[PDB]
Amino acid sequence: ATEIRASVGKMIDGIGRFYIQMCTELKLSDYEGRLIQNSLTIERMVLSAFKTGGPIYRRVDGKWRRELILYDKEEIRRIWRQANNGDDATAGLTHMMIWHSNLNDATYQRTRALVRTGMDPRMCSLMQGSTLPRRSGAAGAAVKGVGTMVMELIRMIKGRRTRIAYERMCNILKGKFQTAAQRTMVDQVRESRNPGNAEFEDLIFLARSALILRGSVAHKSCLPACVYGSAVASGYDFEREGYSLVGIDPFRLLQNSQVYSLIRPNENPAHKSQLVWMACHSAAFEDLRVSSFIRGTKVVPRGKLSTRGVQIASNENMETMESSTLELRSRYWAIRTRSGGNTNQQRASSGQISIQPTFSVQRNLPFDRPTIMAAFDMRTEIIRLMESARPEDVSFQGRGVFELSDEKATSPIVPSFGSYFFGDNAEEYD
Amino acid sequence: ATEIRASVGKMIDGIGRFYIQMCTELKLSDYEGRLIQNSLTIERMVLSAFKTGGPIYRRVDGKWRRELILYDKEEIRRIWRQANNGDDATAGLTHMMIWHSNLNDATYQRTRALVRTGMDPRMCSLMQGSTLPRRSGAAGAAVKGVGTMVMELIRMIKGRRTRIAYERMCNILKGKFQTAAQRTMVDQVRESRNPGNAEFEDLIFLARSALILRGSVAHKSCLPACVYGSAVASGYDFEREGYSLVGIDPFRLLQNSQVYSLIRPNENPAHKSQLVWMACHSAAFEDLRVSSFIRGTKVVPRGKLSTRGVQIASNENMETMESSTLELRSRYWAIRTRSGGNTNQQRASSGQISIQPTFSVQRNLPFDRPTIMAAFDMRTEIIRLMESARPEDVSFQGRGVFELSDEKATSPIVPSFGSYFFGDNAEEYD
Amino acid sequence: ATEIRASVGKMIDGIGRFYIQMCTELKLSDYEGRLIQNSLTIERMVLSAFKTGGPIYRRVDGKWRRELILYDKEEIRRIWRQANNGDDATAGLTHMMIWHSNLNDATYQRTRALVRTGMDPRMCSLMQGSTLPRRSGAAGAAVKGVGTMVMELIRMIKGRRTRIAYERMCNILKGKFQTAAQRTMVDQVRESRNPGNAEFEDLIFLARSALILRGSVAHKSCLPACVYGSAVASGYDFEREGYSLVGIDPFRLLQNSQVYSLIRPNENPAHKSQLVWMACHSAAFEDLRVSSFIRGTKVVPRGKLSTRGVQIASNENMETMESSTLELRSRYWAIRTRSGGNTNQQRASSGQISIQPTFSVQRNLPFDRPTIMAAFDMRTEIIRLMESARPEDVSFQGRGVFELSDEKATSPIVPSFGSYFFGDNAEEYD
Ligand SMILES: Cc1cc(Br)cnc1N1CCN(C(=O)c2c(-c3ccccc3Cl)noc2C)CC1
Ligand SMILES: Cc1cc(Br)cnc1N1CCN(C(=O)c2c(-c3ccccc3Cl)noc2C)CC1
Ligand SMILES: Cc1cc(Br)cnc1N1CCN(C(=O)c2c(-c3ccccc3Cl)noc2C)CC1
Hints:
18 helices, 430 residues, homotrimer, trimeric, viral protein
């Protein structure tokens, strides 16, 4: 833990020093450095570098102005290495990619790409890290969802270093599955010589199963570089204090930060805020109920958000652009989990699925129909297993949210209970 | 459109002139002519004529009095032909039958007739135009529901002009089905020589399918004759202005009309009003949600309506009868559709049917169970097709309600969302 | 009825005289005699007698004190016989056992015992009278649930008087089943020579079926002995007035009684009250909706009750114990039923399970999916039968609740509509 917090603390400290350096280069005011659109361009530039540029937004005579500029990749690559105490520091780079991955996950549906891969577009909840490059970091692998891994595997299916890269991705997917049955099917896809349609059919099956028997997918609060830099500048030592991606730290940092955003004419700044909050705590595919309870205010579905993406395109004119504060704080916090929830055990039950009439009164007599009727080769084992699962089943027994002052997660608050962020479009009402 | 509005405008103009004529014959006051019970008798008389009579209600010394009278069928038949500029005018007649059909559809469940035909009594939503005579008009055919057509077909199954009338009804049903699979099954029932139990079994199957893969059934706002007549009298020219059954016109006319009803001691006039509003816009089997949103006030299920039928029987005594205004106006309007909604296409999906846990918090993990589990000869094609359908699926993408001033349907309002009018009795709570 | 009310009135009159006698022996004040914990010990002592003792709670110098004492079984057995006018009076004894059975049914989940018997722990609603001894009274047999009978039958399966006791329990279970198919399966378990796994598998099947096709299980309001005794003492004659266990009498008696309870530091007295009210009217496995409507205030699930059991263990210290009034009255009353609801008939339907679109408006088009899709050896007959059942189906047509003044059940009030008491734990949210 101390050792982990030490290295994490270093890479966040690196990103910070880099951002401050980059902010002085461009001669940006502190406020300007803390504009989200400016942070994303600077983040983009260091990622492309490993000519490079993008739009940078300044404040001249009461109006927001765009001014795209370019740098040498070598100059940036030099500035990054040196902000990270000599080392090449690839870890801090994939941390900015995962942040971009998370914001993409909240902003865009990847339906157009799912159909090409022959996948059900209703698998979006399985698509964490889909806009993340194949062969990302170890951190990138961890964050990638079951569906993402399946999609990457099909692209391959559809040069003996190709076979090892195939087996690598199979093992990444296998390690994510929490049941033996699901894992044995991955062995049958990996062990296959010259993969084709059978493996395609198998991976589509496995994806569907992961909607019920969920895979272990890592979640990491990753913040725009301007949040870290602003903290390094203001006198916070990430190396002496350490840092966590899954503990309280990102929540605490956001509670001590103020980021800004460019907002368009018709857009609701509160809705823009939800989007960046969701991305910040990797929450695109969380239950809206749990997000809402943590944040304090309601977390509304994508289709009910009166907002477009964070990035302002080259097309649109700056004259109508205004700048708003992003509300990125929370009521409570919670530990970010690697778990997909309970998949097996099946240790007893405890519950009630029907009633026995005591009073002679006119009424319907409720019963849990799917569950009662349910109880009446590896695919067969999988089907039977996911037929046993009920939406009513509770995962993460005992674990709860925490107050912002409870840094050591001493006193968990267990909450009393629309769930899907992407279940509200012109074709479906979920 | 202009040509259609021209003929529609003429037949509504005919009905108007007829009603005014009939109102002067009976020496009725304007108010009395606009009593719904009086309109229904006059409507009945011209339909029977093609001795004939019924109850007529007057206002003598502060009390409502019933006074049944009879006319020569020939005299009525003469009065109808002449109000319709010489022509026999059968179209205007079937328009009054469809109005009666719609009021029946809202007033009575046809369960007793469904059981005799060997049909599930839960098919009421398929029963538009069931009280409409076999071999009605072309308009009558259009308005008749899938279930109605099936019921008529069984009565036949249970004289070579019998075979053509059989094939006619098959084609009416076929034209209503929006899938190839459903249509090919109708060919197999029609092509059959000497129909029997196989065809009975096939048509029962087809009826069940039409609850999910819905048929194209026409909907026509048809108003009591007293509404049209009152407009002709007050100076409205249906021929110069044209008229529509599916556009704004009936809504606009109702917004400029005042009809009355006889109300019994225990009855809620507001509930009586809902019933006649439902009948007026052919809405017996609509989603109560959409009816409520259009009308402005809640549209309550039949079992929660403290009202009986519009017609006051010969048995009941007039001394307790009072007269109320029927509230037949709306907040908005909407185009009446021929469509049954989306049945096929299956072009991608876009949506979310599960969640991925981000926070370590005690909770259930929702998922759309029927949908996920779903994906695991013409009857087989039909079953597979209706197993793909979800109640969550959206039909009529882009189309919405309109303000009463938007005559050209320029600006659609898409609404934000109990659905069944007949799902609230002593045996079922739907 | 008069004859039944006569004998019931006698046994309740016996229990009363016994309790008063026992209260004078222990030199208890009236208030103390009406403390629920004191009533349960006295009840326990007469049941064990047929050395015996338990805790008795007094009020000394502003503090509650525990003082366990013992009696001769023979002395108690003498006191019971004589309070019941000479007779041995076993009936009044099983009435106190059924009361304890009901309080257990409300207090404890029997999941740990269900798993040992190889039964689904979600069958709790079938477990009325599980803590009641095998071979109880005839009254005890009636009150025992389908699941209880199955559990007892397995214990047997897992000395030719063993065979008759086996056949006896089979007949008790058979008489409870409301369908022929379920009854014929019980014949196949009973007729079996040397029972084993086939019978185990059959009885588990039968238990599952009874969640949908419910068995006829008796329900009896049985009150703590202190309620009866307090009424005998205050001048009520149960023998002249008669008494009922299923009519108005227990409701009326509770409305004229005041019982007390020992309450722990953290406990909500209102929640303690719900628990004893539930036990009093045998309502552990009723729909919470109907319980709430009758009682007047909400009847909360077990997991949301901030209370533990009624009995205060020898471990816990009395110094923190305070005494509260138990709120055991109701808004209305209802007849306690022997019926499990409608299981067959299938006489038509009457209802609506889909809609037909009238307006061209963007929306989902609801339909009852399970019901529509449903319609597409004795076990097979059972499966098909329970596949026809819908949670929406109405049982007890016409029957309703009554005002406390309507003793003759003249005017039934039919109510307008969380259902499970045990569907709210750390593993399931039902
Ligand atoms: C930014 C931040 C990020 C994370 Br992850 C957690 N904690 C954070 N802060 C740091 C600043 N902070 C203060 O109260 C301070 C400090 C201060 C400075 C550093 C450490 C502690 C303290 Cl207390 N020095 O002056 C004031 C005033 C609030 C908590
Ligand atoms: C009855 C009605 C049915 C339908 Br379908 C649509 N529109 C309708 N009306 C007609 C009457 N109306 C008026 O404002 C008028 C008119 C008037 C008369 C005819 C046409 C237009 C007008 Cl504007 N002449 O005087 C006043 C006053 C309201 C709208
Ligand atoms: C206890 C009780 C249980 C059941 Br089961 C039903 N009814 C019950 N009571 C009895 C007492 N009670 C009274 O009003 C009385 C009576 C009285 C006493 C006995 C009978 C009737 C009456 Cl009215 N004698 O004085 C007053 C005062 C209320 C109703």
